[PDB]
Design a protein around this ligand. Structure first.
Ligand SMILES: [Zn+2]
Ligand SMILES: [Zn+2]
Length: 279
């Protein structure tokens, strides 16, 4: 009973949230200016992507991007590529991603049609995990899609399978400061597309752990939590949240704000990250 939904960025591009496996999200990027399609985090259960393109939609389907190596994110790369181009498979250089033809590292960009895809290194959950920051260079104010895989979820973070709290702090610092160059004007139009529907458990955590009961961020967390749960209730994805929203509701991301670190009073940022991870 899990539905797709589609997030649109002005007239420039769209991102379709495709529920896969039990709780995974794969994504379809659609560049409207050139009719070019790309998939993110294709696993064994890739047919829902085709059914969407199929039912809902002259198209070039040119790229697959993998946030990290884990099978529930890359297990469909080869099988999806086989049909039938050429299909470029993008993945972080240090994750040895199945079927990769474009290994990438921090600062690299690839084009999907006229869209730019910028790569951010985020080792922790895997040694080679990356994030993909997608936008239209000629339409920067229409917003940004950020694909976070298993590094960041709504109100949450992934397990540190191949790394540690220092690695996650660095990842949170990068995400937090993406838009420093524009005085965070684009935070409100930057949308977060994570690996899984884990929003429920993490929002319950944010609501319980938020330290300042006098702030309206508590009321905000509460309203957001209910909002996401009602979506999940109708089959709708909880995702995406905006980066502006995450900066309020995601306590792990807020480790990148020194005032929040001081308010939590659980040691320095590294200590606090470990405190939150262990709670
Ligand atoms: Zn993973
Ligand atoms: Zn995963």
């Amino acid at each position: 009973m899990r539905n797709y939904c589609t997030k649109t960025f002005g007239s420039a591009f769209s991102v379709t949230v495709v529920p896969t496996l039990k709780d995974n999200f794969s994504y379809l990027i659609n560049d409207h200016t050139t009719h070019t399609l790309a998939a993110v985090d294709v696993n064994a259960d890739y047919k829902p992507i085709l059914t969407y393109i199929e039912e809902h939609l002259t198209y070039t389907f040119s790229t697959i991007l993998s946030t990290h190596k884990h099978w529930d994110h890359s297990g469909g790369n080869a099988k999806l590529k086989a049909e039938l181009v050429p299909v470029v498979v993008v993945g972080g250089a240090n994750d040895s991603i199945p079927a990769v033809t474009k290994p990438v590292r921090e600062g690299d960009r690839v084009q999907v049609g006229d869209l730019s895809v910028e790569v951010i290194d985020a080792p922790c959950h895997t040694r080679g995990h990356v994030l993909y920051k997608v936008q239209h260079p000629q339409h920067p104010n229409d917003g940004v899609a950020l694909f976070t895989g298993d590094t960041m979820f709504i109100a949450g973070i992934g397990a540190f399978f191949e790394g540690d709290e220092k690695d996650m702090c660095r990842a949170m610092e990068k995400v937090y400061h993406i838009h420093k160059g524009n005085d965070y004007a684009l935070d409100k139009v930057t949308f977060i597309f994570p690996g899984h529907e884990y929003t429920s458990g993490f929002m319950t955590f944010s609501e319980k752990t938020f330290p300042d009961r006098a702030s309206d961020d508590l009321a905000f967390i509460q309203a957001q939590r209910a909002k996401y749960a009602a979506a999940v209730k109708t089959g709708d994805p909880s995702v995406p949240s905006s980066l502006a929203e995450e900066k309020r509701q995601n306590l792990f991301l807020r480790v990148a704000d020194p005032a929040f670190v001081a308010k939590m009073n659980q040691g320095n940022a590294h200590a606090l990250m470990m405190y939150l991870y262990n709670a």
